[PDB]
From a paper:
One of the most conserved motifs in class A β-lactamase active sites is the serine-aspartate-asparagine (SDN) motif at Ambler positions 130 to 132. This substitution effectively removes a side chain with an amide functional group from the active-site pocket, resulting in an enlarged active site in [name].
[name] [name] gave crystals useful for X-ray diffraction, resulting in a structure at a 1.6-Å resolution and Rwork/Rfree factor values of 15.5/18.8%. The structure is overall similar to that of wt [name], but notable differences exist. This bond flips the carbonyl of Ser104 and forces it into a cis-peptide conformation. This side chain in the [name] [name] structure has roughly 50% occupation of the canonical position that is observed in all but six homologues in the PDB, donating a hydrogen toward a bond to the conserved active-site phosphate (2.6 Å) and perhaps receiving a hydrogen from the Lys234 amide (2.9 Å). The multiple conformations for [name] [name] could at least partially be propagated through Ser104-Ile105 peptide bond isomerization and are suggestive of increased dynamics relative to the wild-type enzyme.
Residue numbers in the entry: 26 to 57, 59 to 83, 86 to 145, 145A, 145B, 145C, 145D, 146 to 238, ...
The structure:
Amino acid sequence: GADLADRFAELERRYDARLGVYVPATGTTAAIEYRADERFAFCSTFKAPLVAAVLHQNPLTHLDKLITYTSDDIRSISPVAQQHVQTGMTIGQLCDAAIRYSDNTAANLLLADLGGPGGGTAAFTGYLRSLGDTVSRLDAEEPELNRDPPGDERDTTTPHAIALVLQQLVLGNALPPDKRALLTDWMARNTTGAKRIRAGFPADWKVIDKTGTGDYGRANDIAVVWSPTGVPYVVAVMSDRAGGGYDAEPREALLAEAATCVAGVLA
Ligand code: NA
């Protein structure tokens, strides 16, 4: 008799990694949970709820507010923002870049919009508290949030927590449907996750996601997937390879394989 947890454990051993998985239960399906209550660094996965917080806090007209910044605001990696130092970027453009290009400057600017220059990470955490998440915490802005040592609770979430956050944001009622549609669209057009959860699900499944990558071999992806018949699931996959040191290689393929196991039981 097979056991999916044993297969996740095999993946761990094969990649010399720690893997966390959460797929919330539905009316038709059991939860999938593997190290789901263990802490993993957010890395860039926080950018999706960040955009939700900004959407939540403001009228949609706020998307047109122009944010200006200088070259001294640029934090690697900022594929969009570093090309717009002269023009600035609107809040909407920043949300786009933060999700679709994992743009770090965009994320820091959004944190500043949310909670001001000193308060953004605290404001973000407070948004998660408002969704019922009492475990997650954001402490640093980009790029330091990717660099906490293993064991350090700063800048961490759990697969269970982030999955339930994403569930509420995309499938639930955390956002009104207009704002929900914007978040969903940005995630749907993400340029970063083709080799993660997307790679484990057949082509006839829709996948929207937000990736995260950091030190200690951290590679995460949080997604909402729809079956070919329109049935949605939230899939959170987190990993690290802390045993390898701060410069351990993040392994996208581990997330792809984890997602394959998930798809195998959801299909
Ligand atoms: Na400027």
